[PDB]
Design a protein around this motif. Structure first.
Motif, PDB file in Angstrom:
ATOM      1  N   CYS A  35      32.650  33.230  38.031  1.00  0.00           N
ATOM      2  CA  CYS A  35      32.375  33.808  36.739  1.00  0.00           C
ATOM      3  C   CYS A  35      33.704  33.696  36.006  1.00  0.00           C
ATOM      4  N   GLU A  36      33.658  33.489  34.527  1.00  0.00           N
ATOM      5  CA  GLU A  36      34.932  33.545  33.789  1.00  0.00           C
ATOM      6  C   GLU A  36      34.870  34.771  32.869  1.00  0.00           C
ATOM      7  N   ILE A  37      35.713  35.857  33.423  1.00  0.00           N
ATOM      8  CA  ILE A  37      35.578  37.155  32.705  1.00  0.00           C
ATOM      9  C   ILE A  37      36.962  37.475  32.130  1.00  0.00           C
ATOM     10  N   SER A  38      37.073  37.448  30.801  1.00  0.00           N
ATOM     11  CA  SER A  38      38.327  37.828  30.092  1.00  0.00           C
ATOM     12  C   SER A  38      39.529  37.105  30.674  1.00  0.00           C
ATOM     13  N   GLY A  39      39.386  35.806  30.780  1.00  0.00           N
ATOM     14  CA  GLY A  39      40.532  34.974  31.119  1.00  0.00           C
ATOM     15  C   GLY A  39      40.827  34.858  32.604  1.00  0.00           C
ATOM     16  N   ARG A  40      39.975  35.421  33.451  1.00  0.00           N
ATOM     17  CA  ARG A  40      40.196  35.288  34.880  1.00  0.00           C
ATOM     18  C   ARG A  40      38.921  34.870  35.585  1.00  0.00           C
ATOM     19  N   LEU A  41      39.059  34.195  36.723  1.00  0.00           N
ATOM     20  CA  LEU A  41      37.889  33.797  37.489  1.00  0.00           C
ATOM     21  C   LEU A  41      37.584  34.830  38.563  1.00  0.00           C
ATOM     22  N   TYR A  42      36.297  35.028  38.784  1.00  0.00           N
ATOM     23  CA  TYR A  42      35.766  35.910  39.826  1.00  0.00           C
ATOM     24  C   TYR A  42      34.813  35.088  40.630  1.00  0.00           C
ATOM     25  N   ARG A  43      34.633  35.459  41.891  1.00  0.00           N
ATOM     26  CA  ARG A  43      33.652  34.770  42.715  1.00  0.00           C
ATOM     27  C   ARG A  43      32.252  35.116  42.265  1.00  0.00           C
ATOM     28  N   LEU A  44      31.384  34.096  42.184  1.00  0.00           N
ATOM     29  CA  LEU A  44      29.943  34.332  41.981  1.00  0.00           C
ATOM     30  C   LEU A  44      29.323  34.364  43.379  1.00  0.00           C
ATOM     31  N   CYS A  45      28.793  35.517  43.754  1.00  0.00           N
ATOM     32  CA  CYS A  45      28.248  35.716  45.087  1.00  0.00           C
ATOM     33  C   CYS A  45      26.734  35.961  45.016  1.00  0.00           C
ATOM     34  N   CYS A  46      25.946  35.160  45.737  1.00  0.00           N
ATOM     35  CA  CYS A  46      24.471  35.260  45.638  1.00  0.00           C
ATOM     36  C   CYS A  46      23.830  35.409  46.995  1.00  0.00           C
TER      37      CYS A  46
END
Length: 32
Positions: free
Chosen positions: A20-31
């Motif tokens: 995910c691209e949230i406010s300038g940083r990447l987060y893991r997309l976990c499903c």
């Protein structure tokens, strides 16, 4: 699926599925 953007690792039952691209940083997309 059922997905979450996470700051830490995915849950053991989840699969890393992207980022995910949230406010300038990447987060893991976990499903599951």
């Amino acid at each position: 699926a059922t997905c979450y953007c996470r700051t830490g690792r995915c849950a053991t039952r989840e699969s890393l599925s992207g980022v995910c691209e949230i406010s300038g940083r990447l987060y893991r997309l976990c499903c599951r």
